[PDB]
Curated annotation (Swiss-Prot), chain B:
Keywords: Adaptive immunity, Cell membrane, Chromosomal rearrangement, Disulfide bond, Glycoprotein, Immunity, Immunoglobulin, Immunoglobulin domain, Membrane, Secreted, Transmembrane, Transmembrane helix. Residues 107-210 are annotated as: CH3. Immunoglobulins are composed of two identical heavy chains and two identical light chains; disulfide-linked. Interacts with FCGR1A; this interaction mediates IgG effector functions on monocytes. Interacts with FCGR2A and FCGR3A. Disulfide bonds join C27-C87, C133-C191. The chain holds residues 118 to 327 of 399 of the full protein. GO terms for biological process: adaptive immune response; antibacterial humoral response; antibody-dependent cellular cytotoxicity; B cell receptor signaling pathway; complement activation, classical pathway; complement-dependent cytotoxicity. This is Immunoglobulin heavy constant gamma 1. Glycosylation on Asn-63 is required for interaction with Fc receptors and ability to activate the complement pathway. (Microbial infection) Deglycosylation on Asn-63 by S.pyogenes EndoS or Endos2 endoglucosidases prevents interaction between immunoglobulin-gamma (IgG) and Fc receptors, impairing ability to activate the complement pathway. The lineage of its organism: Eukaryota, Metazoa, Chordata, Craniata, Vertebrata.
């Protein structure tokens, strides 16, 4: 598997500066483009 | 449940934790009579109806019936955050629709401790040796364990189910079977553990003749 | 309606002659109206009368749980005697009959290995001692931990897991304080299975 | 526990030269006089 995307995902998952909408948006970009 | 029976299966632990995977909730309906075939599925995420489902009908089972399954892709974060997933099953040979609900186990998550153990001296007599991966202190029991050597996956392993410990946490042991020669040659065997309480939902502990 | 469950004796109880093996007949969901439950115990088709029917316990859901316990001989269970429980109640059309015997299959002798704590675990105040028990058949087994002859109160055993060769394997985890290990305190893993000589084996582990 | 009692039982349980009655009698003697 790709560790970079995994790191990016866990970062977005636990970022306190992101709300539900922003968290899901970031995760979606990781899931699709990473 | 009731014959036709409805079973709701949670996503695979690995799938909800790894962004490279696609976690899904599976809605299986067994014992659906030969006479009455068609079945309708209605998926609900915390009340709200969703339509991204891959609805499936009849697939014959021995006792003159059919297996009616349904796949609904879920967001990793949505499962791990505690969202409830509902499946409404409709059938003509059924008096009222069946509603099953599944969600991630509630409680404070605890970080798993991964330990690798070489084979016992008493086992160095057999042509095949056992490598152990002790995984303790984790919460909830949702976890995935894999073995690998030189980047390539090692699949001749058997993992115990999570066992409830006295402190409320879960533990397990994954046993990998390897040839005595391979262990004694210096080969490095790694154990990969995936859990929500772990950083990046992933850790890897290595073991070799050292 | 009323449901009947017939449980075998504890693996340890059938294997150790100092113990008392017993077959348990559990009856659940008995209505308040007609609570009278009659048990008839049969051993190889012949009716026995040594059963002790425990006083009817009341459940929150207004149901009754009536249990009958039947003491058995170690040799009788181990030699293959069939234990039949017949349960009669008026809220039942015909009496429910349940039959149990010893687990079938060719028994296989388990190999017992003791694994010390990992070098990484030595940073924690409590360490884990392991007991790998493998190649046993059938799954009926009892695993225990002792020290200086007296048992340990911090241990948990995994359920038997099916190996690729068709036999079973398990791990018993003993949790001790790190200092305990570091003295040279001896810890024993005692395993009880029908295929082991004397139904018993003990493997030791120390620093 | 008494290991001698356990040894004597396993041997009586597996003695090929004993019939049910003889084996049951021997096992009884072991069990009662540990």
């Amino acid at each position: 598997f790709n560790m970079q995307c995994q790191r990016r995902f866990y970062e977005a998952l636990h970022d306190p500066n992101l709300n539900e909408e922003q968290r899901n948006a970031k995760i979606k970009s990781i899931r699709d483009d990473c | 449940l009731g014959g036709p029976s409805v079973f709701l299966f949670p996503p695979k632990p690995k799938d909800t934790l790894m962004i490279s995977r696609t976690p899904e909730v599976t809605c299986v309906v067994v014992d659906v009579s030969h006479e009455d075939p068609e079945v309708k599925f209605n998926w609900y995420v915390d009340g709200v109806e969703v339509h991204n489902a891959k609805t499936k009908p009849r697939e014959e089972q021995y006792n003159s019936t059919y297996r009616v399954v349904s796949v609904l892709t879920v967001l990793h974060q949505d499962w791990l955050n505690g969202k409830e997933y509902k499946c409404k099953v409709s059938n003509k040979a059924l008096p009222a629709p069946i509603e099953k609900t599944i969600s991630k186990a509630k409680g404070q998550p605890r970080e798993p401790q991964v330990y690798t153990l070489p084979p016992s001296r008493e086992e160095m007599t057999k042509n095949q040796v056992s490598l152990s991966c002790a995984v303790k202190g984790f919460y909830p029991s949702d976890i995935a364990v894999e073995w690998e050597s030189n980047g390539q996956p090692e699949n001749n392993y058997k993992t115990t189910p999570p066992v409830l410990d006295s402190d409320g946490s879960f533990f397990l042991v994954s046993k990998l079977t390897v040839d005595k020669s391979r262990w004694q040659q210096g080969n490095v065997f790694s154990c990969s553990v995936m859990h929500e309480a772990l950083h990046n939902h992933y850790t890897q502990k290595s073991l070799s003749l050292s």
